[PDB]
Amino acid sequence: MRIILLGAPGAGKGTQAQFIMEKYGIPQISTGDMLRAAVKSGSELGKQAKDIMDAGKLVTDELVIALVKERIAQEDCRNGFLLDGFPRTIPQADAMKEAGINVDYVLEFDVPDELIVDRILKRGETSGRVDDNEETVRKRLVEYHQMTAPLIGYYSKEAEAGNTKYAKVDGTKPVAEVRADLEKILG
Ligand SMILES: Nc1ncnc2c1ncn2[C@@H]1O[C@H](COP(=O)(O)OP(=O)(O)OP(=O)(O)OP(=O)(O)OP(=O)(O)OC[C@H]2O[C@@H](n3cnc4c(N)ncnc43)[C@H](O)[C@@H]2O)[C@@H](O)[C@H]1O
């Protein structure tokens, strides 16, 4: 059971991941988490991200692709995993295809741009990430619309070809209601 969660930053993807991990017994592969951990621990693979992330830019495809390939080769990903924050560009999705990483579900969280900003502010006040500042968040959203949002069509086409199942949920609904709409899809 392999699942990709698509959407804009702050769309609620990490919030919903916990429910999905618990129900299907799979770990979450969050490139954002793996990179912040790399920085903290000084790991050779990923410490380089620190400055890119605080700038609200994307990290290079080559670095994030490697981190992910290493994470998913571990035995606890044998029976599936939940990708949260990867693929974030077309080249990253192409690498998965070329490496034979098929996925069973692609789930798109639709949330308007104006809602993201306020959602990330309200959570940036306690998690103290520099990329949750207001102006950085508006840079991340522009990058999102240019580099990441085309994945919606990329994977809508994959599902048409029978390679995955594609669904959209309305992420403006409250947390419990989003959860239940995702269960209608996955169950
Ligand atoms: N693959 C990659 N390639 C290249 N670079 C990469 C990369 N991956 C990472 N990077 C780099 O690393 C940086 C960080 O990326 P990344 O770690 O991915 O940060 P992010 O996931 O984009 O930001 P969030 O974690 O806040 O988004 P979310 O969808 O999880 O929303 P959330 O659930 O938290 O919820 C948000 C807020 O809303 C709340 N909320 C959640 N759901 C709802 C709801 N239904 N209704 C109301 N409020 C809700 C939440 O409580 C919360 O406060 C990137 O900018 C890049 O530099």
Residue 184 CA to residue 178 CA, distance in Å, equals: 10
How many other CB atoms are found less than 10 A from the CB of residue 63? 17
Which residues, 6+ apart, have CB-to-CB distance to 136 below 8 Å? 54, 55, 56, 130
Q: How far is CA 142 from the centre of its chain?
A: 16
Using CB distances shorter than 6 Å, the residues near ligand 1 are 9-15, 31-32, 35, 52-53, 56-59, 64, 85-86, 88, 92, 119-120, 122-123, 131, 140, 171, 173-175, 178
The CA R_g of the chain, rounded to the nearest whole Å, is: 16
3-state SS, 52-96, equals HHHCCCCCCHHHHHHHHHHHHCCHHHCCCEEEECCCCCHHHHHHH
Alpha carbons within 13 angstroms on the beta-carbon side of residue 165 total: 10
112: left (phi over 0), alpha (psi -120 to 50) or beta: beta
- To test the pocket of ligand 1, the residue of 4, 6, 13, 72 to mutate (highest count of ligand atoms within 8 Å of its CB) is 13
Collapsed DSSP state (helix, strand, coil) of residue 136: helix
Instruction: With beta carbons less than 8 A apart as the criterion, state whether 36 and 136 touch.
Output: no
Ordered by start, the domain boundaries in the chain are 2-29+80-186
DSSP state of 145: I
- What is 2-29+80-186's CATH number? 3.40.50.300
Residue 177 CA to residue 179 CA, distance in Å, equals: 5
